[PDB]
Amino acid sequence: MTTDDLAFDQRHILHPYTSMTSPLPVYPVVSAEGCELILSDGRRLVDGMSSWWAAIHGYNHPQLNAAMKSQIDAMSHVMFGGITHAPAIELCRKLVAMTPQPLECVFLADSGSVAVEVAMKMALQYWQAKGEARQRFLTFRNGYHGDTFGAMSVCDPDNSMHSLWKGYLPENLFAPAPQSRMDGEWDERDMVGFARLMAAHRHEIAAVIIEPIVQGAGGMRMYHPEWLKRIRKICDREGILLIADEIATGFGATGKLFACEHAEIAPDILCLGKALTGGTMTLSATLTTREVAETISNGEAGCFMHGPTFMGNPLACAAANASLAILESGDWQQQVADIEVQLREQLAPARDAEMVADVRVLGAIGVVETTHPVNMAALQKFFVEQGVWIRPFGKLIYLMPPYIILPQQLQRLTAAVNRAVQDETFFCQ
Amino acid sequence: MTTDDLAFDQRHILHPYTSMTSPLPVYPVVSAEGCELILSDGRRLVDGMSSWWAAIHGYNHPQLNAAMKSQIDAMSHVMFGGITHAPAIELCRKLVAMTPQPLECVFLADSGSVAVEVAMKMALQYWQAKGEARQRFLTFRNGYHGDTFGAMSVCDPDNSMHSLWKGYLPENLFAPAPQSRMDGEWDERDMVGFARLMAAHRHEIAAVIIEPIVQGAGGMRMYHPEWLKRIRKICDREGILLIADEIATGFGATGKLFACEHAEIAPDILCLGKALTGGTMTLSATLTTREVAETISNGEAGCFMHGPTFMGNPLACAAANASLAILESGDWQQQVADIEVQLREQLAPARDAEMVADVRVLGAIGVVETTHPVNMAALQKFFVEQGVWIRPFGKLIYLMPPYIILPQQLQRLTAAVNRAVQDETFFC
Ligand SMILES: Cc1ncc(COP(=O)(O)O)c(C=O)c1O
Ligand SMILES: Cc1ncc(COP(=O)(O)O)c(C=O)c1O
Ligand code: NA
Ligand code: NA
């Protein structure tokens, strides 16, 4: 990669949620192996974010690689209309077996946002088919479900800037963010808001959608599992669908295979993505129950009306079959337990820093929330110089490393965090 | 693959737009090479639809393979937030260069639908930054743009069954479907609808969005390029953005590199996907102008508010690069030219079949439109028994084969189509 390649990138290539007139610096990666990213100039970085961009088994994993390569020898892609293949069946068998019993019908898709769109369509088609006038979604504030329009309509209105689309996006019901912590105690006062809303709109709610236990992009919030239990029972009593969005929390991230395990409840609809392919390439899945899947197909449309071009992509399905196989061993449970301990123990000191507002850890996720917003360019440069790759945002410095990370690499990550929040050098902007 | 796998699929695996309570057989494939699909049982089928599912250089193409495997050895994926890489830069270079000049800013994404969502978002944020109250889209009937909510909002309301969501989807403006054919003459009566709508809502319209020349999933319609000429001008006069959705037409499919080339116009926003990666795996791109990209970045938000987890995926960008490099040889122009001729020539006779209403052809797209709907299960089986894979829908039997297809393979495809519409056996 030349400097001219870099100039081209800056002037012509958009990047996630970042300015094209006032763009901050980017770092050129030429390859990756194990737990490290390798930049163009040869520097190696221990990646602390890997799992959040789905790389729970690190990079250049031999099994993942062999699987992808082999499937390429057989067939990278083939359409899924009127056709089926070994990789999609192996994957759906795994998805069905590993998730709660009632989740037995799978709709494969390309991305997480689409997976949420699908869930949202399912709920609406479901009630259309049963002749009920239900088009509203009840969610929590601080939730995040993707960037496409329907997904956006259940994202927190303040965090996602709904004033930008005011009059374009449908208006859903937003109950207050869960206050009870995962670490702590349950306070029944938390329920009043959700409850008030349920009463006023019980007859028009199509589904309760939430990220279980961890609210990711909307604040790395970690709340009490009793919440899920209450929501399931309320949905049970009122006859409402519950969508659980586990695109971020699935496949071991919170210490359990699925965050809903923390409460021993099953949603009617489950969204999955990210770690699903072990972070090799995009793929997603929306699981639902026989009752929903069948009901939808018995209505006016004769089917569930959705179906992406690359649906069921064999290359991506193989990658995921290999990713789930690594999890089959069960080694991750302990890998994460140990990562969980090391994060609590090694992030604790941040509770002593002037710039810190709170610290919280759950599974492979460690968050250090700061009092003031970070300076993106300056803090990013700092981390790179420590030989680590950590990507903050807003008032959040968080880690979610590969489950395979050696204690020596995780220690380097935590020290870099602890060092970044000691004074105000890297804060504000 | 065993029969229990097949039983599992039926019972647990949803497929595109199809019932879970009354699914139709699905055929199990174990591999593919050149232009053939290889069923579990050993039967080989010539694929006639490969290019519509993005596979314009066929299957198991050596150049695409090597590139993908090489990239895998470097890295399959790495996040794009604060990071860049060669596959992403080579791709965006090629995309900027091969599209009209004003299109020089690339938002890479995962899938076509999302690419359309990106465009629509781009348009709304643009006007928002300018302080104008413009939230409606003007499109055309029989248009199809994806299955996500926003994309659905600009799809033909009849074709996509909007009543299901009546009250949830925003109500946009639908000009009538274009009547003038790509084969035929221009008729100016075609404009009145559009003009009446523009006159009444010019002040609230954020953008015009359409599929150029060919309207795919909404009817495989082939209309006159003057339409694009006219729309580009009105939008220019009124200050309105034009979005061109070339997810299905891009990369040589209509005989030009991009169907816009047929009318000699450039849109403000361009959506690409499907053949972008030579049909190996999913990827998408949305290009726009500097005026649009910058204006968005200077508004309230300070940037364009979007960013998928797998944005910029190196593996898919590698594939795409290897696919565009094949197109660089120019060989596709002659390949598609010939396929266009062979298709016109060999489907012509279907015009005389009683089950047929219209035969139209453009580039590597050949369509036989029938008078009644096809018998899905029965026709699919017929095709498979002829050793070909043809996937019809509604009243449409179409082919869109890989550009590398041999005249003999193509002829087997055209022979099957003409045979299929020869009586009502396979209809209703
Ligand atoms: C014109 C057009 N736009 C958008 C799409 C959406 O593509 P996908 O279903 O991959 O999201 C398609 C799919 O074929 C298409 O043909
Ligand atoms: C809970 C949750 N849902 C949905 C998404 C959307 O995933 P994608 O950005 O791939 O569309 C994310 C992305 O991080 C997420 O964390
Ligand atoms: Na299950
Ligand atoms: Na260009």
Curated annotation (Swiss-Prot), chain A:
Effect of a null allele: Loss of biotin synthesis.
Record's signal peptide: none
Marked site (Participates in the substrate recognition with KAPA and in a stacking interaction with the adenine ring of SAM) residue numbers: 17
Residues that bear N6-(pyridoxal phosphate)lysine: 274
E.C. number: 2.6.1.62
UniProt cross-references to HAMAP family, sorted A to Z: BioA
NCBIfam families according to UniProt: bioA (TIGR00508), PRK05964.1 (NF004624), PRK07986.1 (NF005940)
Molecular function per GO: adenosylmethionine-8-amino-7-oxononanoate transaminase activity; protein homodimerization activity; pyridoxal phosphate binding
The keyword Protein biosynthesis belongs to this UniProt entry's keyword annotation: no
Binding-site residues, substrate: 52, 144, 274, 307, 391
Impact upon substituting residue 17 to F: Severely reduces the aminotransferase activity
Organism listed in the record: Escherichia coli (strain K12)
GO cellular component, one term: cytoplasm
Functional pathway: Cofactor biosynthesis; biotin biosynthesis; 7,8-diaminononanoate from 8-amino-7-oxononanoate (SAM route): step 1/1
InterPro entries: Aminotrans_3, Aminotrans_3_PPA_site, BioA, PyrdxlP-dep_Trfase, PyrdxlP-dep_Trfase_major, PyrdxlP-dep_Trfase_small
Biological role: Catalyzes the transfer of the alpha-amino group from S-adenosyl-L-methionine (SAM) to 7-keto-8-aminopelargonic acid (KAPA) to form 7,8-diaminopelargonic acid (DAPA). It is the only animotransferase known to utilize SAM as an amino donor. Complements a bioU deletion in Synechocystis PCC 6803.
Protein name (database record): Adenosylmethionine-8-amino-7-oxononanoate aminotransferase
CDD domains per the UniProt record, alphabetical: OAT_like
Effect on the protein upon substituting residue 147 to N: Loss of aminotransferase activity
